[PDB]
């Protein structure tokens, strides 16, 4: 299937004393493989998947160098943004940056991303063409001019179209045993009776990977969204994911309803019926 690599960075200012709390994480698809946390003792980029541990000490030194440079950039940012927005030194504020690349089934470049937020609002983002910027307000416009003059888009496009995809292919190869394996959902249905006349049917999908999935109900072969509840997909904690969808039905009419499951790891969609 298609693949991605994404890096996520959060910095949170700490009024009164010291530098911001900084947390960086790297992902391949839905698998976290690296982390840096300013509050941790090692002060190094750290492995979070077995397959990245194959990398030598020079990988770790270079990643540590870059992640620390990212955190200083964000440190400076928090001060500049405080000034841009006319804010005091009393409040805690947040900067967030995400970047990375998407590749299709052929592992060739599809899309690249680099976007930035301040206090949880859109600030500046690289446009799909990797040549121009979307600045949300006048402060971000000032940043856009700064980044244009310094040719930031050109540097980023080179990374996203080349380096990002090159290393993605590397990680997918090295981590093939997990990263290239799909785990089809394990599915089952539960029944609960709220009253004499009403029942709840819950359709479960467990232990699946990747996270992307579609779960739906049909009544007598037609889509049913009314009287249904769908929970957010959630991590099991062992690298896999869980989801359920539930429908409220008249008691005795259970057999009319079917649950439909679409996932990359299923050659064909799955159908479940209450037995």
């Amino acid at each position: 299937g298609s693949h991605s690599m994404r890096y996520f960075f959060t910095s949170v200012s700490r009024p009164g004393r010291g530098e911001p709390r900084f947390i960086a994480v790297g992902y391949v698809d839905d698998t976290q493989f690296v982390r840096f946390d300013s509050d941790a003792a090692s002060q190094r980029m750290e492995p979070r998947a077995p397959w990245i541990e194959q990398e030598g000490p020079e990988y770790w030194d270079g990643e540590t160098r870059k992640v620390k440079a990212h955190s200083q950039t964000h440190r400076v940012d928090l001060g500049t943004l405080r000034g841009y927005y006319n804010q005091s030194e009393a409040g805690s504020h947040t900067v967030q940056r995400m970047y990375g690349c998407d590749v299709g089934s052929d592992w060739r470049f599809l899309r690249g991303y680099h976007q930035y937020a301040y206090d949880g609002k859109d600030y500046i983002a690289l446009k799909e063409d990797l040549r121009s910027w979307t600045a949300a307000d006048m402060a971000a416009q000032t940043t856009k001019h700064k980044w244009e003059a310094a040719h930031v888009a050109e540097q980023l496009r080179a990374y996203l179209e080349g380096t990002c995809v090159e290393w993605l292919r590397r990680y997918l190869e090295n981590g093939k045993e997990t990263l290239q394996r799909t785990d089809a959902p394990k599915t089952h249905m539960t029944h609960h009776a709220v009253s004499d006349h009403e029942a709840t049917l819950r359709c479960w999908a467990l232990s699946f990977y990747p996270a992307e999935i579609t779960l739906t109900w049909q009544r007598d072969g037609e889509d049913q969204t009314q009287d249904t509840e769908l929970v957010e997909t959630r991590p099991a904690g062992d690298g896999t994911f869980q989801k359920w969808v539930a429908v409220v039905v008249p008691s005795g009419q259970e057999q009319r309803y079917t649950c439909h499951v679409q996932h990359e790891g299923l050659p064909k969609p799955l159908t479940l019926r209450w037995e």
């Binding site: 270079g62 950039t73 400076v76 500049t80 943004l81 980023l156 990374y159 380096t163």
Partner: peptide, 10 residues
């Protein structure tokens, strides 16, 4: 692998 260049202050 993280980006080197192109990560600039606002």
């Amino acid at each position: 692998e993280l980006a080197g260049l192109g990560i600039n202050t606002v």
